[PDB]
Design a protein around this ligand. Sequence first.
Ligand SMILES: [K+]
Ligand SMILES: [K+]
Ligand SMILES: [K+]
Ligand SMILES: [K+]
Lengths: 385, 385, 385, 385
Amino acid sequence: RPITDVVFVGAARTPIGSFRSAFNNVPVTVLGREALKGALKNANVKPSLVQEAFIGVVVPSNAGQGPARQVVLGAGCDVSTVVTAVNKMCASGMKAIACAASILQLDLQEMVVAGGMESMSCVPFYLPRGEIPFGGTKLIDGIPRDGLNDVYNDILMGACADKVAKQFAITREEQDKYAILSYKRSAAAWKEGIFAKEIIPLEVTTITVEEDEEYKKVNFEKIPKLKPAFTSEGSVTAANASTLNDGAAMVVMTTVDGAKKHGLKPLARMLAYGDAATHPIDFGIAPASVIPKVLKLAGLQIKDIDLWEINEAFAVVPLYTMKTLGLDESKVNIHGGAVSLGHPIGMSGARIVGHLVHTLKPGQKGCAAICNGGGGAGGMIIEKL
Amino acid sequence: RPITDVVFVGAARTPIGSFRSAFNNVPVTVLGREALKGALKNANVKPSLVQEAFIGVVVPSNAGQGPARQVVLGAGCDVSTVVTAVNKMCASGMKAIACAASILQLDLQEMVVAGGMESMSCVPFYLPRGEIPFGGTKLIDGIPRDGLNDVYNDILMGACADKVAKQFAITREEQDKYAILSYKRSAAAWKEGIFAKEIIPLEVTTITVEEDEEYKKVNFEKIPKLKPAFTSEGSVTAANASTLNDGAAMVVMTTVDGAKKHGLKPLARMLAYGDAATHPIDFGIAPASVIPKVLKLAGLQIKDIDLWEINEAFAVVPLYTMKTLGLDESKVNIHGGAVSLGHPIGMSGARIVGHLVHTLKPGQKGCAAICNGGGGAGGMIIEKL
Amino acid sequence: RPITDVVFVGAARTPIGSFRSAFNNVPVTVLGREALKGALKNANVKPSLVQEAFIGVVVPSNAGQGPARQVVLGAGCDVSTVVTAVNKMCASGMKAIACAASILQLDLQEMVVAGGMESMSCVPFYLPRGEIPFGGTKLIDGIPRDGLNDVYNDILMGACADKVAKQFAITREEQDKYAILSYKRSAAAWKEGIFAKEIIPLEVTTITVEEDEEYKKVNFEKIPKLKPAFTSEGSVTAANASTLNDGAAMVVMTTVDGAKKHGLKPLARMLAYGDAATHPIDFGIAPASVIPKVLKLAGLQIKDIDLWEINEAFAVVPLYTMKTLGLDESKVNIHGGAVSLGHPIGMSGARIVGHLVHTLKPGQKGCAAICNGGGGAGGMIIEKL
Amino acid sequence: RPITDVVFVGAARTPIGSFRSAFNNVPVTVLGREALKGALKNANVKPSLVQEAFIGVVVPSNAGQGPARQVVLGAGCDVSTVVTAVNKMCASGMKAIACAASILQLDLQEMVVAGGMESMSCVPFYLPRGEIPFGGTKLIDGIPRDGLNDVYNDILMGACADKVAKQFAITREEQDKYAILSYKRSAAAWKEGIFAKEIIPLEVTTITVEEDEEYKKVNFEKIPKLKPAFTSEGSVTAANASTLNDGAAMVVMTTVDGAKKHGLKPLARMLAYGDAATHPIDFGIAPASVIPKVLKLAGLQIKDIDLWEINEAFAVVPLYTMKTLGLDESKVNIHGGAVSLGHPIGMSGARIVGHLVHTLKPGQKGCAAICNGGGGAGGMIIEKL
Ligand SMILES: [K+]
Ligand SMILES: [K+]
Ligand SMILES: [K+]
Ligand SMILES: [K+]
C-alpha cells in the first residue's frame, strides 16, 4: 500500500482545561475516553470495529494499569482490541498517529484509533522506595521530574527556550508580540465556531465543560511588564510560554478499502510522517529540521503547504521555525496554539493533527510539527479530502 | 519490502536482578544503557549508525524526562537519534521490537534499536496532588498501582491467574511441577553457558553482576508447602508465580540491504508479529489466541516451530497454552523463564525474543508469546540465520 | 505559704480561630507569644521579671524544639527564664497554671507565667520511620492520632461522649438545647464587651483578628436536623460538640509579697486546684468528681461558687455535671464555651481560668473544671480581688 | 512539709537501646510501662496505691493520645490516677521528678511516680497540612525538628557544643580523652554489677534485652581519627557526642509519713531541685549555673557532694562544668553517661537521678545536673538513706 491509502475518518478532542481548574481531579483516562467516544461518533464508526489503538501519554503516574487500555475499553471498544501507549514527550500524540499509520500501510490492521492525552492536574508527587533517609527527603513533583525538566542540563524546558532565544536573537518583544497574536487568534477562532466540529463536551461534577479554558486567562497590558519566568536575564515569561493543562484528542483511521467497506467518508489522507532530533537543550530548533524531512517524503515544497501547525511550546519555537524556513506567518497557527490554549503534554501532537483534519479545505495540505523534551520533533503532513 | 527483509544483527541483556537486591537503587536508565551498549557491540554496529529507537518500559515514574532517550544518549548514540517509549504492560519489550520492524519494512529508517527495561526496585510511592484529606490518606505503591493490579476487577494479576487456573483445571500440583522444571532448566542453562552470548555484565556499588539472581532463590522441598499468594483458596504461590525484578534487553535491527551496506551478519529474520486480546482477567489465555494469529501471518503451522518462548508470568500461562494448542513441553521455555528468572515487566518481551535470536540453531524457527496486564498478548516469530 | 498567697496579676488570650481559617498557617508559637505579651502588659509586668513558665500544648508536632521556650523568648523574657511544657490533653492549660502555683507556694520562684496554646490548623501528618511497606501505607493525621482518638477504645472522643450520653439519658434534644444556649451566650457576651479585657488582637498576613471566629458559624434551624457525627445511633453532632480551633491563653502569677514589691494589683487569688480521673471512655463524667475534690480543698460548698466554667468538650459534659451535682444552669458557662467558641486543646484550660480572673466581681468565687482525653479532669477555684 | 520529707522508695529503668536496634519499632509507651512496673516492684508498692504521675517525653509524635497516661494504665495503675506529661527537652525526666516532689511537699498527694522516656527509633517524619506546593516539599525528620535542632540559631545541638568548646578552649583531644573514659567507665560498671539494681529486662520480637547497647559500639583506635560531626572546623564527633537512643526510667516517691503508712523503706531523700538557663546556643554552660543554685537551696557547698551526674550531652558539657566549678573528675559520672550509654532525650534526666538513688552509699549526697535544648539546665540534689 502507498501511504496515501491511509485515511482519517474521524477526529475529536476535549476542551483543554487550565491547571487544577475545569478538569481538576478528572483522571486522564476519563478525558481520553470522552475524546475517543467523540472521534468514533465523528467517524460514524461503531466502537466494535476498532482493532487496534495507540495513545500518547507522558506522565500517567497513579492513573492505574494501562491507562490507554482503560480509555479504549471505557469508550466501548471490544476487549479484543489491541492497545499500546507511547511516550515521545510532547510529540507523543503525533507519534501515536504515525504508529497507527504504519500498521495500516502494512495491512496488519484495517481500523485503528490513535491520539494523545494528559492530565497534568492529576500528576502525583513521588517518594522513593526504601529507607526514608535520616534528616528527611524531598517529595518530588512528577510534572517537572518526568514531564518538563531536561535531565541532561537539569534545567526546565523554558530555560532551554531562553538559551535558544538568546542564540538566535528572538527578543522578548517578538515573543510577546507572537503570544498576543496567539491569544487573539484563539479567541477569534472560538467566536467564529472554528472548533465546533472537533470539540466534544464533558460533564464534570455538575457543569458542562465545552470551551478551552486557558485563552481568556490573559492581560495584554501586563504582558510586556512580566518578569522572566525561567532565567534572571531571560526573555521567556508565563505569558509567552505554554501552560500546564489537561485534555485529550483522538482520531479514527482506516484504509481506503476499509472506508469503502464500512460506508465511511474519508476526511483526509496521510502524505508523510517522521521525526528529527538534536541536542536536548535545542529542542526548540528541531521542528525546523523535521519539516524539510517530511516535505521530502511527501515530494512537496514549503509553498505547497496551506496551513502549518507548529506547536507553540514557547513563542520562541514558531518564531524560530518561521524565520529560519521562510514561512508565511499568516499560514502558521492561524487559530492559536499552546501558548494561549495550553499544552497537555501527551495531547498536543494529536490535537494539532486533528485540527488540520477538520479545518483544512478539501484539497489543501497541512503540516504539523511538534518539538519535544529530549531534543526531538515529530512531523506530519496530510491532505484534506 | 517483505517482512523477511527485517533482520536482527545483535541482541544483549543485563542479568535479571532480584527485588531490592543486585540492582537496588540502580535506575532503569542505567540498565537500559548497558543492555543497549551490549547489543550494539554484539552487532558490531557503532552507536552513531542508529537512526531510531523504541524502548518498552511500564512504570518509569521518577526516572526523569524521557528515560528511553536517556538510554539512547547514554549508550553513545547521536543526538539526531529518534526515540520513543512504549507501554503495552508485560508485552512492552516485544511491541517495541514490532514497532521497529514496521518502520524498517516501510523503509522509513535503515538502522533501528528496540528493547525493553524495568527497574521495579526503583518504582516509587505516590501522593496525589492537592489537599491531603483530614484523617490522612494512603501512600500508593506504584508497582501494584501502575504495574500489576488489574484496574477493572481490582485484583492482582496473580489473582486473575488463580481464576484462569480453576476454570481450566490447572492444578496447584501441575503449577508446582512446572515451576520446579523452570528453576531446574534455568540453572542447567546457566551451567551449560546458554546465556553467555546474550548476557553483558554490570558493575554496581563495587561488585560485578554477571548472572541472573532469581533462579537460586528457591527451596524445592518447600514449594508444595507454600500458602496461596493471591486468593484464600488459590493455587498460585510465590514459587509458581513470576517475581519482581530489574533488567533490560535490547536488539539491533536493520534490513538485508542495511546489513550488506555495513558489512554486518544477520543473526535472524522476522517472519511475523502481532497481538491479540481478551477480557482483562483472562490475560493468561491470550497467548493461545495470538499464537495462531502470527502462525497464520507467517503461513506456518504449530509443527513448524522449533522453540517456543511463552512468557512465564505464572506457571498457569504456559500450562494453559501448551494443553490448549497441543504443544510439546520439551520445546517450550527450554532454558527457564520468568517464574524462575523473574519478570521486570518492560524487559521480558524483549528478553525472550533476544534469547531466541541467540539460542536458535541456524534454520530453526522460534515463536515468542507474552501475555500482558489488561488482557492482551504479543506474539512474534523469527527464523535463525 | 498558704495557697491564698498565690495571686493572678494578669490574664490575656488570643481570639479563637476556626479550623484552617483566621489563624491558618500561623504556628502555635506565634499565638502563644502574643497571648503572653498581652498577659504581661495586662499585669504591668516587664518581661524581664518573669523567672519561670509552664505552658500547655498537646500536639506541637513540627512546631520545632521547645515551643514553650519559643513563646517565652518571643515575648521578650530573659534567656534566664526557666521553661517547661505540659501535656494533660484538654486539661493542659489548667495543669500548667497549677504547676506554676505549686512552685510559688513553695517560694521556689516569685514571678511565673502559665497558660496553654494549640494550633490545630498546623498539626501535620505523620509517616513512620524506616522501610515504607510494600503496597504502601497510611499518612496519619496528628489531630485524631495524638489529640482526639481514645487509644484504649480506639474511638473518637465524640463517640465516648455518645456512650456517656446514652448511659445517663442525656438526649439529643437536651444537647441541642444546650448547644443553642452556648452559641447565644457567646454572641451576647461578645456584644456586651465581656471579652474586651481578656482579648488581645493579632495581625495576620494583612488583617487584624480580634474576635472569636467560631460562634457565628451556626444555623439554629438546622441544628435539630443534623445527623449524628460519631456513631450511627448517636446523639452527638457537629453542632453540639466542640470544634477544631487555634488559640492561646496566658496568665501572670506571683505571691502577695511579689505583688507588693513590684507595685502590682492582684486580680484574683488561688483557693484550690487538683485533678481526678476515671475510665478513659468516661472522661465526660470526670469533672463531676474533680469538683467536690477542689471544693473540699478550698473548704467550700457548691453554693459558695458564683460562676462555673465547665469546659464544653461536648454539650454532654456540662449537662451531666450540672444535673449530677445539682448546679444552677444560670451560673454555668454564662458567656458561652467550647461548643460555640471552639476547643484548641492545649488552650482551653487556661482560657476558662483567665476568663474567671477577669469576669468575676471582686469577692466572688469561680470554679473551673475541664475533662481531658484519657479519662481525667482538672479543677481549679479562685477568688476575685 | 520540709523538702527532706520527700523520699524515693523505688527506681528502675530499661536498658538503653541503640538507634533502630534493640528497641526498633518498640513504642515509647512500652518502654515507659516496663520501667514503671519495675520501679513499683522495686519499691514494693502495688500499682493501685499510685495517685499521680509526671512523665517526661520530648517527641511523642504518633505515639497516640496521652502516652504518659498509656504508660500509667499499662503498668496496672488505677484509672483514678492523675497523669501529666512534661517536656523540658533533655531535662524532662528530671523536671518530672521535681513536679512530683512539689505536690508531695504541699501534701496534695501522698504516692506519686515520675520519670522520663523516649523512643527516638519511633519518631516519625512530618508532612504539613494543606496544599503540597507545586515543585514538591520536604518530608521533615521529627528528631532534628522537634528534638535536637536549635530553633533560634538553626543549628544542631552538636554545633552549639562546638561553639562552647572553642570559646573555652576545650579541645578535641580533651573531649576524646573524656569520651574514652566514659566508654571505659560504662563497661566497667556493667561488669561490676553496678546497674543490676536499677535495670529491668524487656522481651522484644523473641530476645531478652537486659544490657545497655551503646557502650560496646566503639573503636578506641578510631576515635582520634573521626571527622568533626557538626561543623567543618569542629571538635565534636560522633564518638565524643551523645547518640540517638531508646529507653525509659521511673521513680516512685512518697513522704516520710507515706512510707511509714505503707511499710516502705526510703532509699533516698530530696535536698534540693531547680533550674537555670542562658542563651540557647550556650546550653552547655547552663549546668555550671544550676549547680550553685541548688547547692544554695540545700545549704551545701561543692565539697559536700560525693557523686556528680552531669549529663554527658557532649563531652564538652562535663568538661566545662568540672573546670569551671573545680570538681574532682574522680567523682563525676563515675559509671559512664550519655556519650557512651546514649541519650533518649526524655529519659536521661530521670535515669541519672534514679542511678544516684541506687548507687550512692547510705549517708552520701549526690547532685544531678542536665543541660537541655533551648538553653536550660535542671539540677537536683538527693541524700542516700
Ligand atoms: K501563556
Ligand atoms: K517464583
Ligand atoms: K459546635
Ligand atoms: K558517642
